[PDB]
Amino acid sequence: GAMRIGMVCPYSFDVPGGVQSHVLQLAEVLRDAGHEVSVLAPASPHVKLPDYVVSGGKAVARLRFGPATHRKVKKWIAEGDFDVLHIHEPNAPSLSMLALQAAEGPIVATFHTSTTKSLTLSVFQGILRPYHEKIIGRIAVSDLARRWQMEALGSDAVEIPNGVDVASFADAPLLDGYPREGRTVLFLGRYDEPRKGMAVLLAALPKLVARFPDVEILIVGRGDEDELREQAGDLAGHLRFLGQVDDATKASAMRSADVYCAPHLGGESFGIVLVEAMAAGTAVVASDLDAFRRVLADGDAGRLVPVDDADGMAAALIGILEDDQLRAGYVARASERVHRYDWSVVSAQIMRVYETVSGAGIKVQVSGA
């Protein structure tokens, strides 16, 4: 039953990031399931972390990490006695790649390509290791490596969704004073960046207020309030800024909004926030970018709008708010879909990968043997 799993996170936890958060959530989840997990990462002295995460330090023409670091890592692996070593974003250079090169046996590496989709593969430890390791260094930064990995022979590469704790949203406490009889709409992100599409949401505001005069636009994330109020004109009174909040409050605000609007001009990454919205039971209206269309399943799980279309956005929102049955339907379907993104599933898939790669009696060792 039980398994010992090392994970390597290339990034310090001193700063928020998708990968860091992914790793930690996953680790917690596996530990909850009765596995021994160890997390290696760079020094994160500023934040208080669980006891199973370990620090490797920080350091970096073309140059590599210093000796003390290598020592630390080798120690970690050798005394780890891991059944599986899981590496994240083994970009070259990185802590992860260092680990990947140091170790031997059941090695798995994951590249998080989109916030909602992540490629997972097993390193060739045969005569090809030197060659494959150079390909793995470029997967992060190139389409061709990615392709070749998914396409090639003897390559076990699989795609798995990004994980989410669904309950932390669904069960999130409502914000004091919500729901608003005035119909709140949620925007989430840094609104000074045009690709987040705040401008579109602003363009559609007059119609929205016309048909729903008491509406609030709840805005989470960092940006310039003054400027936006100024661009909002006399409708600026409808805006409410929560600033850049913690995850708990994000979940709360998300759950207490009647609708989540995602008018992104494009990211080709950003989609996971929609998953969080659906898990919160809040109906989604999103721009028609491919990723969003995938997540909402062609328009099954949420309303899709043409990119950079204000009139469409307005019609969509208004339509959602005015008819409650429709909205409820959208939410229910979304709740159906959100299953595949929960950790209990994702963790199972990755566990399958672990089980495939690791045998009985085989432990991760430092090269060579």
Curated annotation (Swiss-Prot):
Keywords: Cell membrane, Glycosyltransferase, Lipid biosynthesis, Lipid metabolism, Magnesium, Membrane, Phospholipid biosynthesis, Phospholipid metabolism, Transferase, Virulence. GO terms for cellular component: plasma membrane. It is a peripheral membrane protein. Its EC number is 2.4.1.345. A 1,2-diacyl-sn-glycero-3-phospho-(1D-myo-inositol) binds at Q20, R62. It is found in: Cell membrane. Changing E193A: Loss of mannosyltransferase activity. Changing K117A: 23% less active than the wild-type. One of its GO terms (molecular function) is phosphatidylinositol alpha-mannosyltransferase activity. GDP-alpha-D-mannose binds at residues 11, 18, 190, 195-196, 245-247, 250, 268-272, 276. Its cofactor is Mg(2+). It catalyses: a 1,2-diacyl-sn-glycero-3-phospho-(1D-myo-inositol) + GDP-alpha-D-mannose = a 1,2-diacyl-sn-glycero-3-phospho-[alpha-D-mannopyranosyl-(1<->6)-D-myo-inositol] + GDP + H(+). Pathway: Phospholipid metabolism; phosphatidylinositol metabolism. Belongs to the glycosyltransferase group 1 family. Glycosyltransferase 4 subfamily. Involved in the biosynthesis of phosphatidyl-myo-inositol mannosides (PIM) which are early precursors in the biosynthesis of lipomannans (LM) and lipoarabinomannans (LAM). Catalyzes the addition of a mannosyl residue from GDP-D-mannose (GDP-Man) to the position 2 of the carrier lipid phosphatidyl-myo-inositol (PI) to generate a phosphatidyl-myo-inositol bearing an alpha-1,2-linked mannose residue (PIM1). In contrary to PimB, the mannosyltransferase PimA is unable to transfer a mannose residue to the position 6 of the phosphatidyl-myo-inositol of PIM1. Was identified as a high-confidence drug target. This is Phosphatidyl-myo-inositol mannosyltransferase. It comes from Mycolicibacterium smegmatis (strain ATCC 700084 / mc(2)155) (Mycobacterium smegmatis).
